[model samples]
Structure formats: structure tokens, C-alpha cells
Target chain A: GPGSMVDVIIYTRPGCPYCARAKALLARKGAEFNEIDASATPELRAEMQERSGRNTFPQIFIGSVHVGGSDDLYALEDEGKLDSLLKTGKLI
Target chain B: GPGSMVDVIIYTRPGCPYCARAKALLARKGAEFNEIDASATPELRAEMQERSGRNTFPQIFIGSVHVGGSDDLYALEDEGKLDSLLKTGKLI
Candidate 1:
């Protein structure tokens, strides 16, 4: 490892570039994330749908807060709160 | 200008919500774009590099494509061709 990256997790699926960007964005932030393939697991997919209230790929989470999809992830960065979230692992 | 969306040209700043979710995924796939922020201009940034040697905020272009952000415009609706680039434009 070059350096310690930040902590995060993302739910992904194949054929979705949004997932790729989500991971890439985190990578650029030099953050380490746990990516799960929800598509492969029926139970997990159901869990995410229930949790996010939407059936979408690239579901993301920052700390305990569900950051929604790739767009939502980008929104956090846009609002200038992504870094803080990353560092503190806090959603607000 | 209600049903004439697409042929996008976004160049946002202040923050980049992945170009506001590809301009809200082309207005939720039913419609609209072409924004100006007064001081808005192509200044790009890091996704700039990660996103095709890019430029400023919302730096979008269709037809003569330069896709790099907003998850590659959802990878052109994931090879679906953005559904006519929206088919609402009247240019030849």
C-alpha cells in the first residue's frame, strides 16, 4: 500500500459505468472502499432496495449514512462535504 | 422551450455533482439543458484528467461527444444511444 486510504463501501453491478466512476472517485480521494456485488446476491439486493428505497446500482454509503447512488455520491463532493465525510466517516 | 431538451451544454462550477447527475439523467430521460453561470467557463479539474483530459464544471457535449463524466453519460445510456440524444432538437 502506498498510503492509507479513506474508508467507504459501494454496491456495484456489471454493465454499470456509474459504479466504475463511484469507485474511481473514491480512489482519487485515495480512499479504500469495500465493494459488494449486489446483483449476484438476491438477499443483498433486497436489502439495498429496502435500505435505499430505490432499485439502482452503485449504491454507496459513507459511514452510517446511505449516500444513495453515484449521483448522490457526486452530490456530496459537490456540496464540499465529501472530504469531511470521508475523513470523519460522518454523513452530516 | 418545453419539449426541446437534449443537445446538452452544461458548464457548471462551485461544485460538481457529477454534472448534476448528467443533468439529472437528461431530466429523468424525458427532458432539458444548456446552462450558464455568468462566471461559468471551462476550468475542469481532476475528474478532468480521469475524465478524458477534460475541462470545467458540467462540461458536457453531445453529438460530437466528449463523454468523460456523469459516469460517461451513463455510458450513453449504456450503449442505448441516449435515446435519440433525446430526439427533440431541430438542427440539421
Candidate 2:
């Protein structure tokens, strides 16, 4: 039920360590998501730049929420609100 | 000195509207960032999934802090922390 209602998106590239770390943590939490590879074309890269205002792998979204990257996610976890946010789809 | 000390990362793709909004906001705030495009490879996609636990575009990070997506960004603004976070590189 949770999976159907929520949508997650990640933008990433190969051979990035932070990208790997971010992905691993998400899996551990059991969240479902969609992946977009920005390495396909320069146009996509530009698009990403226009969207997030930065160039980095593993841009994440949870139901239209930008959860940022690895450390950002960890921060939420550290605050003890990551799980609840994921579960409720609302910021605590 | 501030610009050099801080790093912003954004994961994003083409044709995603919210991604654009996120970028625009960051630009307005005058933040510097790196961009990652995940559509180029499966590994990157998988990596993003692992890290963010979601498959979404425009994952954002400010000095290792995950800011979530467009709505999250706006939420922070609503709470009046977005500006401080961008300016201080610290969560308020």
C-alpha cells in the first residue's frame, strides 16, 4: 500500500562512492523508487542543473520531496524522523 | 571563502518540472553545487536507490545535508530555515 502511493526518484552516475552509500541506506529502509541516469546525455545533465542547482550524483526525491543526498538522509535518520517521514509522507 | 568552503550537489534529470523548481530556488539563494545525472547507467541508478531509498530525480545536498526535493525545499523556506541553511551551511 505504501509503495503504490509514494514515488521516489534518484539521479546518479557510475563510480561515485557517495552515490553508493545513499543507495544502500535507502535499500536498508525498504523504500521503492525510480532511477534516472544523467550520464546519458549532456542535455539531461543540463536539465539536472536547472532543476536542482547543482551537479552531483544521487539526487533523491520522495513523493516530490527532495530528501537531498546521503548525508542529508543520514541527518534525518540521526534526528530520528527519517522513518516517520517515510512512513507518513509528511515532514515531522 | 564561503563559496569555496561549501559544496552543493543536485541529482536530477530532464523533463522533470519539480527538478526545475528546486534548481531555481537554489539559484535565487546563490548556492553553488555539483550535478549528477543518473540516467546514463544502471549502476548509478542502483546506487541512488541504495543511498536515497527512492528512485527520484533532483536529490539535493548542501554540505552533506539532504534537503529533500522541491516541496521539502519550500517547506524549509516556510519554516524559515532555507535561507539560513544556505547562508550558514548549517541547519537552523
Candidate 3:
């Protein structure tokens, strides 16, 4: 299902180091995801807030799931369930 | 307005360490906030990811804005935007 699913999305801002780290983590895991730069469109900042209620950069999602910022993603890895959700395309 | 608004939220883990730092910063700035542990619900882990996306730990928010992780919360402080938002309850 993950082959045809495109639910992993990341909202990032330019010049944000954390954004790169987040992407790198996903790539390292061989997980394919969508990267949206909310900074490009200032409107999207508010949209991001509306969509997630988070006021920060590098907001990430895994199949309609909000993974939070950089550390939040790594926490899944810490818990060792990140790739499980990535590969299976759902909560572990 | 801000006095009655319970919009500021933080998602954290008990031993994350960063969570402590983030809370300390908020206290230093005199900004009252809400802390939620996604690890508690187990279900909220997915909710956090669905809400924020990136992952890791220590997700912070101001009102409806997603401020991101601990570093991000600090970034806003460095940018001189954190206290402002906490005081004005809006974006800079």
C-alpha cells in the first residue's frame, strides 16, 4: 500500500537546519515523502497553523499523521517504530 | 485574551531532557504553557505526528501556531518573537 500511498509530508522553511536533518533522516530510512516549504508562501504559515496548530518550522507528517518537528520524528526512531509506520503506512 | 487562552501547548516525553530545557525556557520567559505527553496515550503519538509531522520530541506551540521543537521554541526567543507571541497571542 505504501507503494501507491503518498501520505508522508514535511513542511519546511528555507535556511532551517532542522529541516535538512529531518529530510536526511527520512532518506536514510529509505522513506519517500513530500516536502512542502511553508516559507515560500507566507499564507501557508497560517495554513500550517490551521492544519496542525503548531507554530514552528519543519512540521512533518506520515500518512496524514503529524510527527511534529525534528525531535518528534527521531522519537519514533528512538521508540524504534518509525520505519515500521513508514513501510506499513500506518500507526504501529 | 491571552490570559484566558489555553492555546500554548507542548508535547513532551518524561526523560527527553530537551523537554526540561523547553519548559525551563518558558518559565524563564514567564510564558505559561501546556504540556502533553504523547507517550502516555500511545495513540497521541500518531496524533502528534499527524498534528506536527516531523517527529522526535518536545513539540511546542503558541496558540494555534506550531512553534516546533525545543530549538524552534528557542529560535523564536532568539528572534525576539516568542515572548511577543506569548504576550500578544498572535504572530509577528
DockQ of each: 0.03, 0.03, 0.04
Candidate 2 structure quality by residue, lDDT tens digits, A4-92: 35565677654432366666877888766566777578887875665443334456666646666665766787888677656555554
Model 1 stretches with alpha carbons more than 4 Å out: A1-6, A14-18, A50-57, B1-92
- Lowest lDDT block of 10, candidate 1 chain A: A49-58
Interface RMSD of 3: 6.6
**lDDT per residue, candidate 3, A5-58, as tens digits?**
455777754432235677778878777767666645768767666744333446
Task: Give the lDDT of residue B54 in candidate 1.
Answer: 25
lDDT by residue for model 1 (B11-58), tens: 454332235676677777755566544232344434344443222234
Better of 2 and 3 by TM-score: 3
Model 3 residue A63 distance off true place after TM-score fit, in angstroms: 42
Clashes of each: 5, 44, 34
lDDT of 3 by residue, B1-92 (tens): 52654557777644322356677887886778776755456687676656454334467777666665677777777888775677554555
Distance from true location, Cα of B71 in model 2, Å: 2.3
Off by over 4 Å in 3: A1-92, B1-6, B14-18, B50-57, B89-91
TM-score for the first chain in candidate 2 comes to: 0.65
Q: What 10-residue stretch in candidate 2 chain A is worst by lDDT?
A: A50-59
Residue A6 lDDT (model 1): 49
lDDT: worst 10-residue window of model 3 chain B: B12-21
